[PDB]
Amino acid sequence: IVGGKVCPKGECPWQVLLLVNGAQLCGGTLINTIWVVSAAHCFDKIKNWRNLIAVLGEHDLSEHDGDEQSRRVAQVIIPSTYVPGTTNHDIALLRLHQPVVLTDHVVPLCLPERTFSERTLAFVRFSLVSGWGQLLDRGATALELMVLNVPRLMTQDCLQQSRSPNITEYMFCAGYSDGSKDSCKGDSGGPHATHYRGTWYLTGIVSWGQGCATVGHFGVYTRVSQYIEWLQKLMRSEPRPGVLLRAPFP
Amino acid sequence: ICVNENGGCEQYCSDHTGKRSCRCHEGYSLLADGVSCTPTVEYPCGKIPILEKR
């Protein structure tokens, strides 16, 4: 996260840290006790699927305070329409091997209904983006979870305000063109959370952009409203052997 | 009518003919006003406990 602030401990309780062999891979969002929503691109280079860990209740990477809960990722579900090395359909649904325990520090973010997300949430101007990604372009990643407030743009306005992959109906722009504030590569998969009438909802996933906080460029986020039914149907399905699952989209 | 101001609903809105029904995400219940959602669980989704308990 560029130009944000530390998320005070316990104020981003749905934030997930994805690890591969103990190394920082991506972020994610907890949506209930067993399911995590992340970006499909986070898994393009995985070879050791058994080394994939999700950490909940994480805040500061330098210390263990006892609120962290780590779980093995039993399944990574990616839409059939996602093509590795490309930008479209950048979403992954992760099944944890064992449920996490909900506490003051571990709470799911609401996965909204499609209608409510399209008709209402899509019009809330500002939303929060978070992660332990780069604090600057070509800079070090954060030790404490960072949060940033970003305004959402209409796709026409984003193309007209920008100085390249297309911005599809499965994406949206959010952020600033001045080079001061953005989510970065290490934030990938993390939440874009929207507040509405006292409750926070999942509206986007940190997906892509052109370098972090680059002048004339906005952050690009997976438009989660397009996947609500895809996600819901998968959550009601029985697990299948194998870690990686490609599921038909739509 | 759900298209306009979320049909007055705090969370989800369903159109029914001419008729509107508000709904809530799991871990919440709809109040008698027919619009408000109240938590039914200790850790409802999208609420920050350190902030709620403050």
Ligand SMILES: CCOc1cc([C@@H](Nc2ccc3c(N)nccc3c2)C(=O)NCc2cccc(S(N)(=O)=O)c2)ccc1OC(C)C
């Ligand atoms: C769909 C992923 O697309 C991409 C992801 C990233 C980079 N992530 C991010 C995330 C949020 C950002 C933001 N808000 N602002 C600025 C830059 C940002 C970069 C990342 O993860 N890299 C490592 C990486 C992992 C896996 C596959 C591929 S890819 N798609 O470039 O082959 C890149 C960069 C370029 C991408 O696509 C190109 C084609 C424009």
Ligand SMILES: [Ca+2]
């Ligand atoms: Ca820690």
